[PDB]
Amino acid sequence: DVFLMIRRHKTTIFTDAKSTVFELKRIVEGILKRPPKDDQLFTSQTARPQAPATVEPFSSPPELPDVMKP
Amino acid sequence: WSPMHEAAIHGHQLSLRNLISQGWAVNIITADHVSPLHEACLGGHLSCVKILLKHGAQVNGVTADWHTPLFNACVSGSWDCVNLLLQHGASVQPESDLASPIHEAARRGHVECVNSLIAYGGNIDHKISHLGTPLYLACENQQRACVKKLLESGADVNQGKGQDSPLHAVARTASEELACLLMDFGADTQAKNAEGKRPVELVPPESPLAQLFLEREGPPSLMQLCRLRIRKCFGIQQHHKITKLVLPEDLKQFLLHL
Amino acid sequence: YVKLISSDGHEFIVKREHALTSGTIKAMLNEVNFREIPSHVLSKVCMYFTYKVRYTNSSTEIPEFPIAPEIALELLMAANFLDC
Structure with a gap:
């Protein structure tokens, strides 16, 4: 199983799959309603549940407190 | 024979002040290199330690069995002595693996002594081959309050003795109390020792520890x-x-x- | 599937059974607004849900859940508010 974030505009879909891109385009259809990577048009290691692969940017974290620095 | 050693063994602070004023030396040592300060510390005799330090006793003398005054104070449990020696520059880090102040205080559950040794710059994670870390000995001896003090201080919850982690020693011991504690500070339940075995495998068939290591086998x-x-x-x-x-x-x- | 919405506007679509890892959400339960959790936290929170469910007993070694220090405090506040 392969765990991915599908992101487009300020929305993010969190799901998992395997096989091919074909049925994956329809997975979106049955969620956000539409007809069926990096700068282009996925493994046990490249997309773990806790580290999903991305398929608008998030808010920026605040500065680290001083006591929490090295 | 030696009146100074003899007075220091029993905590006779009047006899000591008497001996000193008659002219007896304070830095007198036996053939084993034991000074009256060593004996005073061993007994936890704070008044006698004060008197000897005031008259220039040496706080870092090493006996033939590798004991320092600080080590003995850690055997006695007198936190006041330990503190007083640390103030006078008693070395926190000994040279012998046979007499480590922080380990002796940890195996005996002398929390306050442990606390002071750490405060003065002692290595909380010092790993001696044949003993382990101070965390490890405190676990072996089921010293609950040393364990909690060491963990709270930032001791590495996973460094024990060799490949045996503190969670292992705790499992053999069957301490449900110490097991929960180590897990709160992040002990690895999936670590294997020199025998390939994991902590859960060392706990009796009839314990809730097995369910504890396994029910919390999740994240x-x-x-x-x-x-x-x-x-x-x-x-x-x-x-x-x-x-x-x-x-x-x-x-x-x-x-x-x- | 449920819609979790962060404080700066991002919309997170996750499996309902996963989002049920938060007791706080389980109570409120098809669209949950979070006026205090920012997107860079809520995203990590959803990842934790995925991680939690997937590894909630797979007889394998569970891997470390990465947490950069700069988000730890806000994430702890979120974990507290969400009971997970």
Whole structure:
């Protein structure tokens, strides 16, 4: 199983799959309603549940407190 | 024979002040290189330690069995003696693996002594081959309050003796109390020792420890995960600085394990 | 599937059974607004849900859940508010 974030505009879909891109385009259809990577048009290691692969940017974290620095 | 040693053994502070004023030396040692200061510390005789230090006793003398005055004070349990020696520059880090102050205080559950040794710059994680870390010995001897003091201070919950982690020693012991404690500070339940065995495999068939290592075989709560990560940013005995964070008091106490 | 909405506007669509890892959400339960959790936290929170469910007993070694220090405090507050 392969765990991915599908992101487009300020929305993010969190799901998992395997096989091919074909049925994956329809997975979106049955969620956000539409007809069926990096700068282009996925493994046990490249997309773990806790580290999903991305398929608008998030808010920026605040500065680290001083006591929490090295 | 020696009146000075003899007085120091029994905590006779009047006899000591008498001997000193008649002209007896304070830095007298036996053939074993034991001074009256060593014996005073061994007995936890704070008045006698004060008197000897005032008259120039040496706080870092080493006996033939590798004992220093600080080591003996850690055997006695007198936190006042330990503290007094640390103030006068008693070396925190001994040369012998046979007489480590921080380990002796830890195996005997002398929390306050442990606390002071750490405060004065002792290595909380010092790993002696044939003993382990101070955390490890405290676990072996089921010294609950040393374990909690060491963990709270930032001791590495996973360094024990060789490949045997503290969680292992605790499992053999069957301490349900110490097991929960080590897991709160992030002990690895999936670690294997020199025999390939994991902690759960060393606990009696009839214990709730087995269910504890296995029911919590899943992942910790995200709050637990955040706590481990945040505490990992502070150095030894710096975690109090969590006070200075802009955070609800409930969470500061959670991070401080209070 | 449920819609979790962060404080700066991001919309997170996750499996309902996963989002049920938060007791706080389980109570409120098809669209949950979070006026205090920012997107860079809520995203990590959803990842934790995925991680939690997937590894909630797979007889394998569970891997470390990565947490950068800069997000730890806000994430702890979120974990506290969400009971997970």
